[PDB]
Amino acid sequence: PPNLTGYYRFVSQKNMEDYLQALNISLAVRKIALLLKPDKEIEHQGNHMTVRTLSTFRNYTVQFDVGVEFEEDLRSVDGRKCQTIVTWEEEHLVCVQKGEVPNRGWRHWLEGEMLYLELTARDAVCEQVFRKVRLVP
Ligand SMILES: [C]C1=[C]C([C])=[N+]2C1=C([C][C][C][C][C][C][C][C][C][C]C(=O)O[C][C]([O])[C][O])C1=C([C])[C]=C([C])N1[B]2(F)F
């Protein structure tokens, strides 16, 4: 599987409204979240990954070894905890977050320097795109 290490700048998103509602995020917080352009930073070493979502209001970091289910602390996101498993399906990094919310998870994949992210919760599907930042001193 590919190595996903990189810093990727926000490009676009669609239907984040839907995903936020599906996680039961309040109107006040959804209004804030829809204004921001969070970046994605990944540290992928061997079979271990750290994935950071970075914004001026709040950051969220998760760590994992691919293939090992773990308790994901999402209390800073939607107040919940999940039993989360990340796998590789061809070149897609697939995450299933098992818990209260059905169909919860996400999928990354790369096309050149564009990093795609699909986010799901209940019947909501959000599509995001990021672009890798080149290491220019
Ligand atoms: C400010 C605030 C507050 C709060 C609470 N909020 C916000 C916002 C904005 C800011 C940002 C934060 C971070 C998040 C993370 C998760 C997703 C990604 C992910 O999943 O990823 C995936 C891979 O890549 C790893 O992980 C938001 C959004 C945009 C969304 C959401 C849900 N939100 B929330 F409701 F949490």
Side-chain angles (χ1 to χ4, degrees):
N3 187 284
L4 297 185
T5 297
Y7 190 107
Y8 309 80
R9 195 174 295 140
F10 180 94
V11 170
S12 65
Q13 78 190 349
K14 74 159 167 163
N15 293 304
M16 179 54 81
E17 295 86 329
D18 288 348
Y19 177 77
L20 289 159
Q21 292 176 334
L23 295 183
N24 308 114
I25 304 305
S26 69
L27 170 57
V29 178
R30 298 201 308 276
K31 212 166 172 303
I32 298 167
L34 293 171
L35 294 169
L36 306 177
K37 309 182 145 313
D39 290 340
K40 197 71 58 166
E41 189 255 4
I42 297 172
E43 291 159 38
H44 184 192
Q45 194 176 225
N47 196 44
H48 183 269
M49 288 206 190
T50 297
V51 187
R52 307 177 199 278
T53 305
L54 305 169
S55 85
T56 57
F57 273 71
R58 164 167 291 180
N59 304 309
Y60 177 70
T61 291
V62 67
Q63 270 197 116
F64 49 85
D65 292 315
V66 184
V68 182
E69 200 160 284
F70 65 101
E71 184 173 78
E72 189 179 359
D73 185 358
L74 289 152
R75 286 180 292 177
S76 77
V77 176
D78 68 326
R80 301 187 170 97
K81 285 176 185 165
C82 291
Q83 287 169 323
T84 296
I85 179 63
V86 184
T87 55
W88 284 111
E89 299 190 3
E90 289 86 53
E91 298 278 286
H92 289 210
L93 192 67
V94 179
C95 181
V96 178
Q97 296 164 312
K98 288 170 226 173
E100 175 188 326
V101 180
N103 309 312
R104 188 181 180 160
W106 49 259
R107 283 183 84 109
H108 289 283
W109 71 99
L110 283 166
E111 298 183 16
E113 281 177 313
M114 311 300 300
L115 176 67
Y116 285 79
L117 179 57
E118 176 164 291
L119 290 153
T120 62
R122 308 186 192 276
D123 287 354
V125 186
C126 167
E127 301 296 349
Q128 296 187 309
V129 189
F130 307 83
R131 179 169 263 281
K132 200 177 176 156
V133 171
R134 294 186 175 167
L135 304 181
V136 176

